Each structure stands twice: as C-alpha cells, then as structure tokens.
Amino acid sequence: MKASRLYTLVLVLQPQRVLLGMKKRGFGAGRWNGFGGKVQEGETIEDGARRELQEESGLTVDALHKVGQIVFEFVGEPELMDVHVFCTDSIQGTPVESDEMRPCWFQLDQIPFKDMWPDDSYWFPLLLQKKKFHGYFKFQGQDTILDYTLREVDTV
Ligand SMILES: Nc1[nH]c(=O)nc2c1ncn2[C@H]1C[C@H](O)[C@@H](COP(=O)(O)OP(=O)(O)OP(=O)(O)O)O1
Ligand code: NA
Ligand code: NA
C-alpha cells in the first residue's frame, strides 16, 4: 500500500468559457492547468481549494462544489497524489498573472487539451456534462499514461 498526499484542483467553469493557468517556470512549464496545490494542516479540503485558488489566480470565492477525485501515480515516486477537484459557484473579480502562472480564458470549443495534462482529456468532458467522477492515472514522466481508470459516480 502507498501513502497519499492531498492536493486540490479548481476549474473556474462558466457557461461558455473556462479559466486555466499556464505554468511559466519551475519544472512542467508550458502546460495549462486548473488552480490548486497542497492541502495544509487543519483546513478542510474545500477551504484549502479556495485558499489555493486565491493564492494561485487572485480570485476569491465563498464556495465551491466538488466534482471529482483523481489519484495520480508516477513511476519512481512512491507517494500518490490525491487530487480533489472542484468547480466554482460564482466569481466576482479578475485573475492575476504571477511570476509562476499566467491565467487565460478559453472558450469551451477551444479547450487546449494538447497543452494540458493528458488525463484532462478523459475527465474534463465529464466536468462539462456536469457529471461527477473518480479517476486514477499512472504516468511515466509527464506525458505517458501507462494505466488509468475513470468512472462516473453519484457522490464524490
Ligand atoms: N496529472 C495532472 N492533471 C491535472 O489536471 N492536474 C494536475 C496533475 N498533476 C498535478 N496536477 C495539479 C494538482 C495541483 O493543483 C497541482 C500540483 O500542486 P503543487 O505541487 O504545485 O502544490 P503546491 O504549490 O501547494 O506545492 P509546493 O511546491 O510544495 O508549494 O497541479
Ligand atoms: Na500550497
Ligand atoms: Na504549485
């Protein structure tokens, strides 16, 4: 059995567009992603997702709704990433570029799948259909899925 670390991922999804963030530096730059990071001690996962959204994008929201959970496993890494996925209820401000991340809106017929994590091609369509899901993806490096599961669920 492995240990898992908790992470969040927030999709700012509006009726016709979605906000994504492009990684500018570090390792993994060039890829568009939702907003999130590691859950911290003592906060609920949802509150951690809100905190990370604000830190990462500048957007503040009072509430999210949970839409999925995805476990990532990487060859050579014993720790699993347990990612809790949320969508925004409403927003009321503008996103901000940081030294690390550039936010950009995409129309929902221009979702930039080829420049997103490969798993997003599988689960983000469910998110657009307002379905809930559980997933698991095993990666070799950043680009190659060796095994995965995806299932629609009634409760995340
Ligand atoms: N395969 C994948 N598909 C996806 O859509 N999002 C992924 C992903 N793999 C990781 N992510 C997301 C999850 C989370 O929002 C983020 C990873 O969090 P980070 O490690 O950057 O967190 P922190 O910024 O809290 O970490 P520190 O560097 O310790 O400050 O990237
Ligand atoms: Na963090
Ligand atoms: Na980060």
GROMACS .gro file of C-alpha atoms and ligand atoms in nm:
model
  189
    1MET     CA    1   0.000   0.000   0.000
    2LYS     CA    2   0.111   0.356  -0.069
    3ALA     CA    3   0.073   0.680   0.118
    4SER     CA    4  -0.108   0.971  -0.045
    5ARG     CA    5  -0.071   1.348  -0.019
    6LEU     CA    6  -0.375   1.575  -0.058
    7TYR     CA    7  -0.399   1.830  -0.337
    8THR     CA    8  -0.673   2.049  -0.478
    9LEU     CA    9  -0.771   2.148  -0.830
   10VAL     CA   10  -1.027   2.418  -0.914
   11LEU     CA   11  -1.186   2.469  -1.254
   12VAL     CA   12  -1.333   2.814  -1.299
   13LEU     CA   13  -1.605   2.699  -1.538
   14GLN     CA   14  -1.859   2.946  -1.678
   15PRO     CA   15  -2.134   2.873  -1.934
   16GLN     CA   16  -1.913   2.942  -2.237
   17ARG     CA   17  -1.555   2.951  -2.111
   18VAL     CA   18  -1.309   2.810  -1.859
   19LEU     CA   19  -1.016   2.984  -1.690
   20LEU     CA   20  -0.685   2.795  -1.695
   21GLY     CA   21  -0.337   2.882  -1.576
   22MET     CA   22  -0.018   2.837  -1.776
   23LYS     CA   23   0.290   2.732  -1.582
   24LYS     CA   24   0.567   2.981  -1.656
   25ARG     CA   25   0.864   2.829  -1.471
   26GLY     CA   26   0.997   2.554  -1.245
   27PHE     CA   27   0.954   2.209  -1.397
   28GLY     CA   28   0.643   2.141  -1.603
   29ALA     CA   29   0.616   2.488  -1.759
   30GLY     CA   30   0.423   2.534  -2.082
   31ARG     CA   31   0.114   2.343  -1.965
   32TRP     CA   32  -0.234   2.479  -1.888
   33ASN     CA   33  -0.395   2.359  -1.566
   34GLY     CA   34  -0.666   2.433  -1.317
   35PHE     CA   35  -0.567   2.613  -0.998
   36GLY     CA   36  -0.461   2.435  -0.683
   37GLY     CA   37  -0.192   2.292  -0.465
   38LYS     CA   38  -0.131   2.105  -0.142
   39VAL     CA   39  -0.386   2.094   0.136
   40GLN     CA   40  -0.246   2.229   0.463
   41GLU     CA   41  -0.291   2.105   0.818
   42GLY     CA   42  -0.619   2.192   0.985
   43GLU     CA   43  -0.814   2.327   0.685
   44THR     CA   44  -1.095   2.142   0.512
   45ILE     CA   45  -1.016   2.026   0.161
   46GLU     CA   46  -1.274   2.271   0.023
   47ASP     CA   47  -1.124   2.559   0.221
   48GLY     CA   48  -0.779   2.457   0.100
   49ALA     CA   49  -0.909   2.465  -0.257
   50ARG     CA   50  -1.044   2.817  -0.205
   51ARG     CA   51  -0.718   2.931  -0.048
   52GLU     CA   52  -0.513   2.787  -0.331
   53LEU     CA   53  -0.741   2.944  -0.593
   54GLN     CA   54  -0.684   3.285  -0.435
   55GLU     CA   55  -0.309   3.239  -0.396
   56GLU     CA   56  -0.267   3.094  -0.745
   57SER     CA   57  -0.513   3.303  -0.952
   58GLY     CA   58  -0.609   3.604  -0.739
   59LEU     CA   59  -0.976   3.504  -0.748
   60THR     CA   60  -1.168   3.485  -0.423
   61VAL     CA   61  -1.481   3.274  -0.395
   62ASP     CA   62  -1.700   3.198  -0.098
   63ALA     CA   63  -1.794   2.846  -0.207
   64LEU     CA   64  -1.704   2.566  -0.443
   65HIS     CA   65  -1.878   2.247  -0.543
   66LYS     CA   66  -1.691   1.919  -0.553
   67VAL     CA   67  -1.696   1.743  -0.889
   68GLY     CA   68  -1.434   1.469  -0.871
   69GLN     CA   69  -1.136   1.299  -0.716
   70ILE     CA   70  -0.834   1.177  -0.909
   71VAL     CA   71  -0.537   0.977  -0.783
   72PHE     CA   72  -0.208   1.021  -0.972
   73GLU     CA   73   0.079   0.777  -0.952
   74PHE     CA   74   0.418   0.847  -1.110
   75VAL     CA   75   0.678   0.587  -1.196
   76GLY     CA   76   0.963   0.625  -0.947
   77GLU     CA   77   0.755   0.821  -0.691
   78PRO     CA   78   0.613   0.610  -0.405
   79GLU     CA   79   0.373   0.881  -0.286
   80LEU     CA   80   0.035   0.909  -0.458
   81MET     CA   81  -0.122   1.245  -0.536
   82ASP     CA   82  -0.483   1.251  -0.419
   83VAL     CA   83  -0.639   1.541  -0.605
   84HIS     CA   84  -0.980   1.675  -0.504
   85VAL     CA   85  -1.143   1.856  -0.794
   86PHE     CA   86  -1.387   2.144  -0.756
   87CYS     CA   87  -1.573   2.391  -0.976
   88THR     CA   88  -1.657   2.749  -0.881
   89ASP     CA   89  -2.011   2.855  -0.794
   90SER     CA   90  -1.958   3.220  -0.897
   91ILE     CA   91  -1.668   3.462  -0.915
   92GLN     CA   92  -1.660   3.838  -0.870
   93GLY     CA   93  -1.316   3.963  -0.965
   94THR     CA   94  -1.033   3.936  -1.217
   95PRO     CA   95  -0.750   3.678  -1.236
   96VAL     CA   96  -0.392   3.797  -1.197
   97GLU     CA   97  -0.069   3.684  -1.355
   98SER     CA   98   0.207   3.588  -1.114
   99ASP     CA   99   0.573   3.515  -1.177
  100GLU     CA  100   0.473   3.147  -1.179
  101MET     CA  101   0.141   3.138  -1.365
  102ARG     CA  102  -0.046   3.321  -1.638
  103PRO     CA  103  -0.426   3.284  -1.635
  104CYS     CA  104  -0.624   3.285  -1.957
  105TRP     CA  105  -0.984   3.224  -2.054
  106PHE     CA  106  -1.065   2.961  -2.318
  107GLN     CA  107  -1.395   2.920  -2.498
  108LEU     CA  108  -1.548   2.576  -2.447
  109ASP     CA  109  -1.497   2.485  -2.814
  110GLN     CA  110  -1.124   2.571  -2.777
  111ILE     CA  111  -1.025   2.371  -2.470
  112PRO     CA  112  -0.646   2.339  -2.510
  113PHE     CA  113  -0.626   1.965  -2.445
  114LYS     CA  114  -0.295   1.912  -2.626
  115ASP     CA  115  -0.130   2.161  -2.386
  116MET     CA  116  -0.300   2.025  -2.071
  117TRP     CA  117  -0.208   1.725  -1.860
  118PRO     CA  118  -0.301   1.416  -2.070
  119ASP     CA  119  -0.552   1.289  -1.812
  120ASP     CA  120  -0.760   1.604  -1.856
  121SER     CA  121  -0.873   1.479  -2.197
  122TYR     CA  122  -1.055   1.197  -2.020
  123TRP     CA  123  -1.216   1.365  -1.718
  124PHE     CA  124  -1.272   1.725  -1.824
  125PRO     CA  125  -1.552   1.626  -2.067
  126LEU     CA  126  -1.742   1.481  -1.768
  127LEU     CA  127  -1.699   1.809  -1.587
  128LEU     CA  128  -1.855   1.986  -1.886
  129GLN     CA  129  -2.153   1.748  -1.873
  130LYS     CA  130  -2.198   1.826  -1.502
  131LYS     CA  131  -2.111   1.468  -1.408
  132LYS     CA  132  -1.910   1.366  -1.103
  133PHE     CA  133  -1.617   1.126  -1.127
  134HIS     CA  134  -1.342   0.923  -0.968
  135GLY     CA  135  -1.022   0.864  -1.162
  136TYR     CA  136  -0.677   0.713  -1.131
  137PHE     CA  137  -0.386   0.768  -1.371
  138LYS     CA  138  -0.035   0.617  -1.366
  139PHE     CA  139   0.226   0.823  -1.553
  140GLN     CA  140   0.571   0.757  -1.688
  141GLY     CA  141   0.710   1.109  -1.670
  142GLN     CA  142   0.482   1.396  -1.770
  143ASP     CA  143   0.338   1.274  -2.099
  144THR     CA  144   0.269   0.898  -2.093
  145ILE     CA  145  -0.022   0.720  -1.926
  146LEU     CA  146   0.055   0.353  -1.851
  147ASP     CA  147  -0.272   0.266  -1.675
  148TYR     CA  148  -0.586   0.454  -1.579
  149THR     CA  149  -0.941   0.420  -1.459
  150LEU     CA  150  -1.229   0.664  -1.486
  151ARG     CA  151  -1.581   0.622  -1.357
  152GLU     CA  152  -1.884   0.841  -1.322
  153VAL     CA  153  -2.020   0.843  -0.967
  154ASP     CA  154  -2.326   0.986  -0.796
  155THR     CA  155  -2.131   1.109  -0.491
  156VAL     CA  156  -1.769   1.218  -0.499
  157LIG     N1  157  -0.194   1.493  -1.397
  157LIG     C1  158  -0.250   1.609  -1.352
  157LIG     N2  159  -0.363   1.657  -1.407
  157LIG     C2  160  -0.421   1.774  -1.370
  157LIG     O1  161  -0.521   1.816  -1.434
  157LIG     N3  162  -0.371   1.848  -1.269
  157LIG     C3  163  -0.260   1.800  -1.210
  157LIG     C4  164  -0.195   1.683  -1.248
  157LIG     N4  165  -0.086   1.664  -1.171
  157LIG     C5  166  -0.086   1.767  -1.084
  157LIG     N5  167  -0.189   1.849  -1.108
  157LIG     C6  168  -0.223   1.970  -1.032
  157LIG     C7  169  -0.274   1.934  -0.891
  157LIG     C8  170  -0.240   2.060  -0.812
  157LIG     O2  171  -0.336   2.161  -0.837
  157LIG     C9  172  -0.106   2.098  -0.873
  157LIG    C10  173   0.013   2.037  -0.802
  157LIG     O3  174   0.029   2.106  -0.678
  157LIG     P1  175   0.170   2.165  -0.635
  157LIG     O4  176   0.261   2.051  -0.604
  157LIG     O5  177   0.215   2.268  -0.729
  157LIG     O6  178   0.123   2.232  -0.496
  157LIG     P2  179   0.184   2.347  -0.404
  157LIG     O7  180   0.205   2.468  -0.487
  157LIG     O8  181   0.099   2.357  -0.280
  157LIG     O9  182   0.326   2.279  -0.369
  157LIG     P3  183   0.463   2.344  -0.312
  157LIG    O10  184   0.555   2.340  -0.433
  157LIG    O11  185   0.506   2.245  -0.207
  157LIG    O12  186   0.431   2.483  -0.265
  157LIG    O13  187  -0.110   2.051  -1.009
  158NA      NA  188   0.047   2.547  -0.149
  159NA      NA  189   0.248   2.500  -0.704
   0.00000   0.00000   0.00000
